[model samples]
Target: HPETLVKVKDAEDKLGARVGYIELDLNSGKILESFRPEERFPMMSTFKVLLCGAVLSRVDAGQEQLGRRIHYSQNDLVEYSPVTEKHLTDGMTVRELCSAAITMSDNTAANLLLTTIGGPKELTAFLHNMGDHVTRLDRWEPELNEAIPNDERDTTTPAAMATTLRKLLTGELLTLASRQQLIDWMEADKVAGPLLRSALPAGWFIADKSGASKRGSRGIIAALGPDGKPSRIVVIYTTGSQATMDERNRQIAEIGASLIKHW
Candidate 1:
C-alpha cells in the first residue's frame, strides 16, 4: 500500500535519488505493488523491449523477419556499450541486434533496432496499437553526444511499461509465437551491474532487462512461478541518484530485496 511506497521514496530520498517502481503479479496479470508508478523517467536502454515488440509486430504481420540485416558503421557507435565497443565495422541481423541491445545494453545495437523500425514514432504507434498512451521516444543514441536532458530521452512511466509487458508476455496481445520470442529475448538478458538481480530467492531464474544512463538506472524483471503462473515481476527506474554510483546501486538493491520478500 502507500506505506510501502512511502518507505521506498524515503529510502531513495536519503540516498539522493528519486525512485519509482511497479511490481506485477502476472498470474493475475496486474500490478501488485508500486511507488510513483506513473512518474515519467528516461527508459534509456529499457526501451529495447518496445523496439523488440515493434519489430516483432511486423513479423507477426508478415512484414519483417528475424534474419533481416541492419547495416552500421563506427559512426553509429555510442559510448557505454560493451557489445559495440569491441567492434566498429559491420552490421548485425535483427536477432543479433536484439541480443546485443537486450543482453548487453549496447547502444549501437539499440540504435540499429530503432532505425530498422523507422524511428521512435513507429514504436509509439505500436504502443498505441496495444492501447498504451504514456511513452514517447524522441531521439536516438547519436543524440546522446549532445547535452540533452535525460527526461527527454525516450521516457515512459513504470506503470506504462509494466502494463504493456504483462499483456505482451502473457499472449493477450501479440501472437503466441511473437510472445515466445519476446520472452526468449528478454530471458537472454544478462543481469547487469545492479538492481533486482541479487535480491530474488535461490533457484529462481528471472528474465530481465536493465538500463543505465545519466538519467540513472532502470530495470524490469519477470519470472513465472512453479504454479505455471507469473508470480514475480518488477519495474524500477531512478533519476538523480547520488554522487556515487555505488550508493545508488546499493539503494536499489536494498529496495529490491524488500520487494523480493513481499512479492
Candidate 2:
C-alpha cells in the first residue's frame, strides 16, 4: 500500500513545500513507505541521538562513569537564549549533561557530553559498529562558532536514522539496561519539535529526538504501548522549504498523526 506516499504528496501540496518521510513497522521491520528516505540533509540536534547511544555504550563497557562531573569550558559555549547564559559556569554531571543535551538541545551540554564520550570520531565509530552507515557526525556548528568557522555540519538519511532508533530500542546499540536508559532520556526531552510530537495521539509515550539547522529540520519518533511492546517508528526530514517553520511543522505533525492512526 502506498499509504505513506499518498500522504506525503498531500502534505507537500497542502504546505506547498518539499518533504521527506519514512514509516517503519517495528513488528515486521518493514518499511511501509517512504518519500526520498535516503536523501541526506543537515541532521541538526538529531545527531544527539547517536551521541546518546555512544555515551551509554561507553558506560556499558565500564570505560566511563555516568555520574562523572563534566565542567563546561568557555569554548563549549554556544548562544541560544540569554537566559541560559547566566547558568553557564555551573558544572553538570554526565547524567545531567546527557539529559540537558536531549531535553533542551543544549549545544554546550551536547558538546560536553560528546567530548566526554569521545567526540565525532567515536560517535561515527559507534554507529558503524551498530550497522548504521547513513548517519554522520562532523563537528559543532552552533551560532557562537560562526566567527571561528567550522564544517558545514553532519548529515543523515531518514532510513539510517530509523535503523539507529530500532537498534537502540532492541538493545542492539548498547546493553539492555543502557538501551532502556537512553529511551527514558529521550522521552524526557523538553524541546518538542512538531515533526513527531504533533503526530502522536495525546498521552501516547514517544521516545525520540528532533533536529533543526540552517539546512532544515528532521525528527524521529518511536512509540511503545503500556505493555512495553514495539509500536511504531517514523522519521520525517525536509529541505528546500516553501513555507514557514510553523506551517512545515504542522504538515509534519499531520502526516505523522495520520501514519500512527493507520498503523
Candidate 3:
C-alpha cells in the first residue's frame, strides 16, 4: 500500500537514518511497497546469507562440496564467531560453516566461507554473474562493518538486495536442493531478533538474516512464512543514524508493524 511506504519514511525521519526497504509479493514478483528503495546501506552480517548463497552456487556447479572438512586453529578465530570459536579443535565441514554463518551470524564462519569462495572480490564477481551489479563486497568481516556515509563499499540498495534474495531463494539462481539449503539455514536463524521479528504480529513466520554495524546501521533480509505457501520477501535497512542500536531496532520494528497492519 502507498500508506505503508509513507510509514517507512516516517520511521526513517523518527529514527534519524536513511531507511531503505522493499516488500515483494512472492507469487507475482510484484513490488508491494517500498521507501528510499534505491538507497544503499551497510550489509553487515546480512551479507552472510548471500555469501552462503554464492557458496551454494558453487556447490550447484559441482565446484565445491559441503561435506569437505576445513580445519582451523585459534588464529582463524574472530570476534562474534559463537559457533566457530567452540569448535576450534575439531574444525567444521563446509556445510556446518554455512549454517553457522547464516543461522548465527558467525563472523569467523563467514570469513572462512568468504575465503573459501576467494574473498570479497570473488563474492562481488558472483553477484555480477547473478546480475546483481549494485551489491558489492569490498572487504572481509569487522573491517567491512565500517559503514561510512556516502561510501558504497560493502553496501547494497534494498531493492537490489530484495531482488537478489528473491532470485536465490526462489530456486532461480541455484539448484532446488541448494535453494532449500539456503532457506533451511535462514529458517534456523537465531540472530534475527529484538528487531523486525519483535514487531511482527503472531502467526507471521519469518526466516531471516539480520545485521548490525557501525553508525547505527542495521538490516534484515527475510522471507516471511506460513510454511509451504507463497511467502512475501522483505528487505529492510537503516544507516546514518546516531541513535543507539535499541532505538534503531525499535524504529525498524515499527516499520515492520506498520507493514503488517497495512497488509
Candidate 4:
C-alpha cells in the first residue's frame, strides 16, 4: 500500500538515504508489496549469506565436503571481525567457516570461504543456476572497505535477496541435509545489528542477517509465526545515505519496525 511506501519515504528523506525494500510471502514467492525493490545496493556482509548458500549448493551436488579443513593465518585477518581472531592461528572446517560467516558476519571467514571455492565471481554462476541473475559477487572482502565505484561493488536488489532468502528457507537450493545445516547456521546469526531483530513481533522468531557500508545498511529477516511456519519476510537494502552514522542506523531500524507496525 501507499501507506507503507509513505512511511518508508518519510524515513528515507529524514535520513537522506534511498531505502529499497520488499515484504513478501515465503511459500509462494509473491511480493506482498515493495518500494524500489529492484534498485541495487551494496550488500556488505549479507552477501555472505548468499556465499553460504552457494557453498551448500556445491555440497548438495556432491562436489564439496563440509569437514574439509580451511586454514587461516594472520594474513587472512581483517578489521571488524572477531570470529577470525582466535581461529586465525589454526584453521577451521568448511562447515565452521559457513557458521562463522553467517553467525559472526566475519569478513576474514567469508573471504576464506570465497577463496576456498575459487572466487566471488563463482557465486554469479551459482546464482544464475538458481534462476537469479541479479545477485552479483564481483569483489573480495579486502576490497569491502575501499571506496569502489558503484558498478563494481558487490550488490543485490531487495527483491533479489528476499526471493533468494525464500528459496533458501523453502529448501529449493540445497539438499535436505545441507539445507538443514544452512538454516541452522542462519538461525545462529548473532549480529543482525538492528532493523529486523528490533522489529520482531510477539511470539515470533526471526532469523536474519544485516549488512552495512559507508553508503547505507541492508537486512533480510525470515520470520516464523507462533505456529512454527514461515510467516513473513522483510528486506530493506539502502544506499546513498548522507546522515550521521547514528541517525542512519536509527533510520534503518525505523524502516523495519514500521513494517511490523503496519503489517
Provide the TM-score for each candidate, comma-separated. 0.87, 0.86, 0.96, 0.91
Q: What is the C-alpha lDDT profile of model 1 across 1-263, one tens digit per residue? A: 55557657866777666677887777676667787888877777677877888888888887888887666677677675777656555556787777788787777887878777888788888888888888777788845322234445477888888878776777467799888888787767775546666675666656778766664454454553434444556777777653566666666677766765555
Candidate of highest lDDT: 3
Ranking the candidates on TM-score from highest down gives: 3, 4, 1, 2
List the RMSD of every prediction in angstroms: 2.8, 3.6, 1.4, 2.1
- Candidate 3 off by > 4 Å: none
Clashes of 1: 0
Q: Stretches of candidate 4 above 4 Å error? A: 145-152, 221-224
- What tens digits encode model 2's per-residue C-alpha lDDT throughout 1-263? 36657777887687654567777777678887777787765677777767877888789889888898766556557765232344557677788777877777777777777777667877887888888876777676374122111243476777888877877777445787887888788888777756666666555778777766553343445544424556767777666554677776777677766676666
Q: After superposition, how far is residue 224 of candidate 2 from its true place, in Å?
A: 4.9
Reference-based TM-score, model 3: 0.96
Instruction: Tell me how many clashing residue pairs each candidate has.
Output: 0, 1, 0, 0
Supply the global lDDT for candidate 4.
Answer: 0.75
lDDT measured at residue 233 in model 2 versus the true structure, 0 to 100: 70
Question: Would you give me the overall lDDT of model 2?
Answer: 0.69
Which predicted model would earn the best TM-score? 3
Rank list by lDDT: 3, 4, 1, 2
Q: Could you tell me the lDDT of residue 231 within candidate 3?
A: 82
Clashing pairs in 2: 103-190
Tell me which of candidates 2 and 4 scores higher on TM-score: 4
The better-scoring model by TM-score among 1 and 2 is 1
